Design a binder for this molecule. Structure first.
Ligand SMILES: [Sr+2]
Ligand SMILES: [Sr+2]
Lengths: 298, 62, 298
């Protein structure tokens, strides 16, 4: 029903800590601006207007931060904790949630205030300002699609049936349509329908010493970018994150984490921005993907 | 200038080369129009160095 | 009676979507300024005044965006829709309608605000700022004019009538006036009375491989500009848009759309600004024109 505001320390991460700024002890109220500003570069010649390129600028969000402690001791511990947690991580993920959407915005601490104007039991009413890194993006699970064989029908499918030695008739419209393909279970499409800005993938390699990872193809079947690594031994899984702020590439074997940056193919990895097409798994047994795609206004 | 891996699959080296090649070996001439809307900047260059005072008061020593 | 404001995703186009900001669920209220600022470059020497050139400057219109929705879900769905619809197209045309006129302005989204000060059933009350591309222009239908032969009158017209072998008399004032011209159906004039700045013509070609398009003549019968194309096959129609922001020169054959820009004669097309005179049809059987002409204050 009503709007929800979560504050994540490290979304997509094992060390995530969530703060409910809508329900918890530390609450965010009255956001300054959730909209957007744009500079269109409109230059005019003799009354006629020509438009350049729109640079969508995101403005600082200022919240009326309130604390709901039972004692002066509680309210101080809430300020000493909440503010330091935002400081411990280089950037914090604010989640906007409503009946229709669940968008996220990466914030950086711009300004926080601490004053001695208290209410009852040492209550806090202060203003917290954040700088925008990326405003509104959808963090969602990405999975492959499977292809299934169509059912076999007499007279419709290509089969030699009925009276021996079989018969298939050429009709007009109904004629003969192939049922499916022998072992259609080989076909798997990792479909990319909209332009994705950043992602977090878990790749399980099959063969050691063979470049392992993922390549990206466009609508015409041409490769533009690839995240490929040539390791010495079979890693249990390869944890790859495309996020610019905390780029992570690593090979996991048991409880040991290995840096895969120097082993990576630098020429194949042409871009971070994924376009409309499909993803192929190079020397992988299994793959788990979480895709984050931007939205300017929501 | 372009950085690209060696042509032969046997050679594993990454190499740097200079390009003096085009999409067409036998270059063809194109005919197009440039509108004022494309924020056009017109300025005059000089390919060959030749002198700028068109009139000459020439003196010959006696 | 009362005025009407209507936001258009793409005017002059098949993929148009119109939002009524006067009667619909999302409304525009109290426009900031609909007038104009002028800078005349006036310099005064010894009490005497000298005036330069007037640069008519158009100011940003700031509206009062207000949604009316049955539920919080409804109004959040209205803000996400209306704004994305403005963002989806590079520019949006706002229609200004009153008892006397129907002008249009090309706008670009400058700033939109989203706050948590909700009224009843979660209703938005925000400020939507727009940048001026072109302020006030008339989008009207341009058609050719036909010429008809004058009636034949005995004694007045040049004919050898009455008593054989005919007779025509030279009188003073009434004398002999030619009735018309043999095949008066050949004469057609696409009259241009005021300076126009852009247009959306639908040209239907006659002969293939023969340059097809339009040419413009001034008051003395001299060509100043011409949009003409030399195609290999007869196009069903050539859809041309002279608008600077989304210039389109495409030919259509069946359900297939072809870009005709490289086939066009670049020498003849000297200007976009059409002057007072007439327009001719080169190798065209039929033509449909929509002319847009600017007005500074309305
Ligand atoms: Sr992270
Ligand atoms: Sr248009």
């Amino acid at each position: 029903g009503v709007r929800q505001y979560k504050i994540h320390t490290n979304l997509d991460g094992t060390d995530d800590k969530v703060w409910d700024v809508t329900n918890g002890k530390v609450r965010f109220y009255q956001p300054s601006n959730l909209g957007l500003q744009s500079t269109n570069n409109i230059w005019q010649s003799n009354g006629i207007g020509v438009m350049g390129t729109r640079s969508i600028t995101q403005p600082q969000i200022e919240f009326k931060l309130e604390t709901f402690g039972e004692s002066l001791e509680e309210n101080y511990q809430l300020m000493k904790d909440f503010v330091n947690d935002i400081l411990s991580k280089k950037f914090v993920t604010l989640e906007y949630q409503t009946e229709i959407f669940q968008v996220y915005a990466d914030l950086a601490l711009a300004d926080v205030t601490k004053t001695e104007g208290y209410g009852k039991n040492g209550t806090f009413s202060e203003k917290i300002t954040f700088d925008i890194i990326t405003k509104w993006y959808t963090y969602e699970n990405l999975t492959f699609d499977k292809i299934q064989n169509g059912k076999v029908i007499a007279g419709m499918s290509k089969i030699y049936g009925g009276t021996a030695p079989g018969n298939y008739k050429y009709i007009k419209g109904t004629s003969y349509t192939y049922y499916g393909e022998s072992d259609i279970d080989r076909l798997s499409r990792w479909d990319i329908k909209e332009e994705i800005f950043s992602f977090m993938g878990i790749l399980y390699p099959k063969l050691p010493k063979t470049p392992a990872g993922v390549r990206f193809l466009d609508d015409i079947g041409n490769e533009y970018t690839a995240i490929v690594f040539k390791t010495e031994q079979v890693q249990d899984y390869i944890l790859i994150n495309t996020d610019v702020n905390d780029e992570t590439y690593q090979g996991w074997k048991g409880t040991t984490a290995l840096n895969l940056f120097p082993v990576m193919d630098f020429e194949r990895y042409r871009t971070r921005i994924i376009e409309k097409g499909q993803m192929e798994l190079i020397n992988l047994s299994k793959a788990e993907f979480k895709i984050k795609r931007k939205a300017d206004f929501v | 200038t372009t950085i690209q891996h060696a042509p032969s699959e046997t050679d594993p080296r990454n190499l740097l080369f200079i390009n003096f090649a085009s999409r067409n070996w036998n270059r063809k001439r194109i005919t197009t129009r440039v509108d004022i809307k494309q924020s056009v900047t017109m300025d005059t260059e000089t390919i060959v160095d030749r002198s700028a005072y068109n009139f000459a008061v020439v003196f010959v020593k006696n």
